[PDB]
Symmetry: C3
Subunit: 445 residues, 3 copies
Amino acid sequence: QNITEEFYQSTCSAVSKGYLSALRTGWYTSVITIELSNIKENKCNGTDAKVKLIKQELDKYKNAVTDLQLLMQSTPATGSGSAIASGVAVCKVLHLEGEVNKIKSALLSTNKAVVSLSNGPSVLTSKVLDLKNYIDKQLLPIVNKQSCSIPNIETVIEFQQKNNRLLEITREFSVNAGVTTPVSTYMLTNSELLSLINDMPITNDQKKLMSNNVQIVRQQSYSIMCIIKEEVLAYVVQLPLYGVIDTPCWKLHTSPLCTTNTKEGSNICLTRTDRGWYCDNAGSVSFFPQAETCKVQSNRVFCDTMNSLTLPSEVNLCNVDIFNPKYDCKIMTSKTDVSSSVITSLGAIVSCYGKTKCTASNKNRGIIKTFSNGCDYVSNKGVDTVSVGNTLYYVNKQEGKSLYVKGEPIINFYDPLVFPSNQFDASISQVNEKINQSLAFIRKS
Amino acid sequence: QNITEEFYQSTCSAVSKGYLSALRTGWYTSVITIELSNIKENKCNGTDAKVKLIKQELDKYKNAVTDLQLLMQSTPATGSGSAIASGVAVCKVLHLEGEVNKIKSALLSTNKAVVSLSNGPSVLTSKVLDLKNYIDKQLLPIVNKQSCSIPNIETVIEFQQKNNRLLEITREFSVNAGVTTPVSTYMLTNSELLSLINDMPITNDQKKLMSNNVQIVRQQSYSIMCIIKEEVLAYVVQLPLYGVIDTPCWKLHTSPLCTTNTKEGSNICLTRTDRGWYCDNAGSVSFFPQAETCKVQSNRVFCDTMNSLTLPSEVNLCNVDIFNPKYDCKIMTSKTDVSSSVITSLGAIVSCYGKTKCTASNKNRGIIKTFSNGCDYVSNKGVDTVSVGNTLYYVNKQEGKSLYVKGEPIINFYDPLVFPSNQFDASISQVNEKINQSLAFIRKS
Amino acid sequence: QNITEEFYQSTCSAVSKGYLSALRTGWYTSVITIELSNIKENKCNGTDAKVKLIKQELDKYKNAVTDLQLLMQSTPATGSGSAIASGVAVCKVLHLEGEVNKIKSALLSTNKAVVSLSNGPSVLTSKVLDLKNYIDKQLLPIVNKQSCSIPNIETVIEFQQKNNRLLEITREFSVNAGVTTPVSTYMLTNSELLSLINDMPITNDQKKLMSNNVQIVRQQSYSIMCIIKEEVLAYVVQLPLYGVIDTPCWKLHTSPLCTTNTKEGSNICLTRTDRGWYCDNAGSVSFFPQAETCKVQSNRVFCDTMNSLTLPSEVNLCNVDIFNPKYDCKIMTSKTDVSSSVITSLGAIVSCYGKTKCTASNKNRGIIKTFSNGCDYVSNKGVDTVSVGNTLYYVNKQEGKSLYVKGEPIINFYDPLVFPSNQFDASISQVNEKINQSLAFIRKS
Ligand SMILES: *[C@@H]1O[C@H](CO)[C@@H](O)[C@H](O)[C@H]1NC(C)=O
Ligand SMILES: *[C@@H]1O[C@H](CO)[C@@H](O)[C@H](O)[C@H]1NC(C)=O
Ligand SMILES: *[C@@H]1O[C@H](CO)[C@@H](O)[C@H](O)[C@H]1NC(C)=O
């Protein structure tokens, strides 16, 4: 895939093109079970050091079970649960009489199995750990007699290893109120995640997509605690379904565009708004304003449509003609001429004002470009760093072509006296209407 | 408890009522000690594999102690320490001569004990781990001779288990500069937290409150590292005291309210401000603007009054009459007609504008409601999802009654030509004064 | 070092002086290697419990290696990688043919060694764990025969201890997409960090600085995963270089300054902007607007110049004469008279308006000061807490001198009718120009 960039000198903005999308649009919920042992404390006259170690690890198991019990009594309403609703609906089904018994029956002979619930949905269940078999077969003959039988040291170690995953899951669920994200390897192993991806009702190319970006899949997944009941600990893992694939995505970068007059206080500034990620989606454009809502791998963007706005496709015309009537291209105005830089995908935008020392250097050649007052841009081809004031930015060394689109900075088309200088989220046409109304008070005079 | 909702069509806002409060107003500090062993490295000609394992775990203990020492030399001033002041004041007392010796004496025979410090306060101390007894009784006869005695394999395992909590506490305190929140099970066990709640000078009903929401108590607690001195590692756990209980709490939801003219650029928008949590508190209302400052369980809100504003009780009249002179009901204005949705507690607000496809569906029936241009609302009774553009929101399936309060959208009472379209944090009466002043420039003409 | 404060009654702002700087200006990258064992699964008829435990831990090692392999295929472009560029450039060199073989040769006999790469830079390499020697010497004679040899129980335990660090590093790198910050003790031990500081090409006083603030150094460091290839797991640790040292730093605190008229809706408010940390840097001032970008220890501020603005040194004149023409001192305006408090370094600013109950108390004396309507200040000398409405703030008990600089609140110099009441990021002179233009519409009438 070819990554390209376009800096528009007229609007002090740059667009990084050539990225492919992966937008989350659905959820695939799955039930994860850990078969537990319903045991009560048993006392046999014991003093052997091995017996002591076993009883110690067994108390750590019983506290973990009671901790999971007090965790499942309190079921969280933290937030709008608008992104976990899919799994919360499964937990409400699991609380029905006979349903934990149902999953207990389907996973009686195999580890994984599809189960048709009574509410309806066809969930895929897994048995990832079997403590009921281990405690009842290897541990009860040790503690459930008049006098304790003596266990071998291999057993002490094997029980600390098996019980460890239960303890770590109780630790995470206790500090996070039953909802964890990302989903850790304790909640779901890479082997278990990959087998769960392979068993999903998705296309073969989409299974390849999730398997090559398992870390992004974990960051976009949730683990919700359901119930501990009748020797079963169940929790739902909610994995992302990417309904939008291989669509064009671009990233808009904006920087303040001011005039460069020599008398401070006589300068006016304009900045394009809505910087961030844009992706073509179902005849429209899905816009992502928060910076942390999109993880990028290679040329592919992984966004959650949960935190997007839906805009008309004409919003891209702000990149080719900011003055085009098909779309009201919004700006913000000020008189705050502070220098800054934006590291883009293939270069750097620099807004230099005042006495600020703006420059672009190569590690071995030194300063190769000095920016003047105004908004400018430099490609990463031959540039390693950019210094603005006392701050040094590193340029991304990604391969791609940059295009410098020359044009008059549009801030020069504005008369300063009638400029609206405190506008946040203003349209180009809105600013023009405030200027036409301010021109009428002068028309009479 | 009955959860109810009221959508006000006139102001594009909804109020979720019936929630009970738990506001944090005080702190209960407590001293947590780990009795350590003042040992220096001891060398005996040793090569036995068991002796090697013991010396390895002992070096991990000595590095943990030196790591805690370099952690306590640097005492943080990170932030205004305005919420840890209560515990920082105890750490300054612990540094006095004889005070670590005092706690060392009170916990000489029992694990928990109340101690009257020299500064004054009556703190409750605990001994959660005893490494001085274990290292000096089970380990020194092994390393403090000419030739090492041979330890049994149970001892190697018991020492890795006991030393583990010390190592994990040093790990958390090293990456977090001595202040951790929430308070982990390593800092304080659920058994230790529950016993600490039971031993607190609080009402019996309030102990029941903290014991049923231990995960929320952990998220609202702090663990502060004090000192390692004279075979004692001490750190203060600061637990929340909820001075406001069972008060009425409601959640205000707001969404943009625009006109629906057919020519873009001729539309004006209004949005109610100060969305969030409101709770009755001491004759006033405690308002919480940040979303993460309130954890909800069932019908109970758990807020920290540290991040609240105090407002007059007349602020609720913005919910019944936005035009009421007893309180200046604030709005923000714009010309940005972008579609969005808000998932409320019992339904969903939808602001639909332009060509956006807004709809509300049931999983098995399909589309059951199409929203028109404007601000509207749908209850969760029969609705599962709401789609706005390319985004799908899930509706909370919580039981409750919704009330649709019909009324003319107030944005229609405004003449567009004289509307103030860039107002952030503006009052209703403030906007009316800008309109009366803009009406005077037209009165003469 | 003497900490001092100055509250300016005229502008409702306070300045905390006497702090020394440590600004991050460079990066020191270092290569961290873990020598691994290229083994494939080996099967010998085995049933001994010790053999089973060893094969279990060996599968956990092989899954960790395959997990690191799928982690290094996906190389992240998450963000602008503008702060990890230095290490990402080293990872691209490590991928060259013969370079992992080069580091494998330089660390063949010693643990640490400086290596001149082919790209150029002179990196310092370390071998922190040696699994190739341990697996090939202690484990292969156990699994690579016709029938398995029987290992001793000390070996089972020693292998779970050595393999543990590899597993924890794979766990962190899997959930964080190869880039972790802060740098944990698993990524780099305190002993390894301190030895790495001692071996750095920095001044001896600067090594003392980083060694006494290792927790701040970890919070300002990055760990980047490079490659697993040819029995080598390599990742770069990027440590901060503090180019600005012992410079003057002050903290600006601002609070709303309103008029105290008795009729609500007739009041105007002004607040100084750009609150935060200021440090002298290279003839200018480095300003830090985000609150979490500066960690404070004692009297020293540790900032990253990556998130700073560079301002002229005349910006300090807003603290002595807000009306001074050398610098355009910016304010924001509103009519939102909401009470609040700011805990400063040596006292507290209180903006009290309306019916709000503002007070300052001592724990044992009770209320010692009642604030009137307006903006006021109290030193921490004799004050423990400050209550504003239903909120109680704790005052920092740091030793220092406070100075109350009396002056007329400048909001009283403004005629309310012509005040600009919706100004964000406005200069003093900008507001005066809007008043001169609004005075001309009245001049004719
Ligand atoms: C300003 O007036 C001119 C006509 O004189 C018109 O072409 C233009 O569209 C107007 N702009 C706005 C924003 O109303
Ligand atoms: C506008 O003027 C009318 C009187 O003509 C008055 O009733 C109203 O309160 C005024 N509004 C403001 C905000 O001053
Ligand atoms: C306002 O006018 C006076 C002269 O009458 C001048 O001294 C002052 O600088 C002007 N202020 C601005 C902001 O233009």
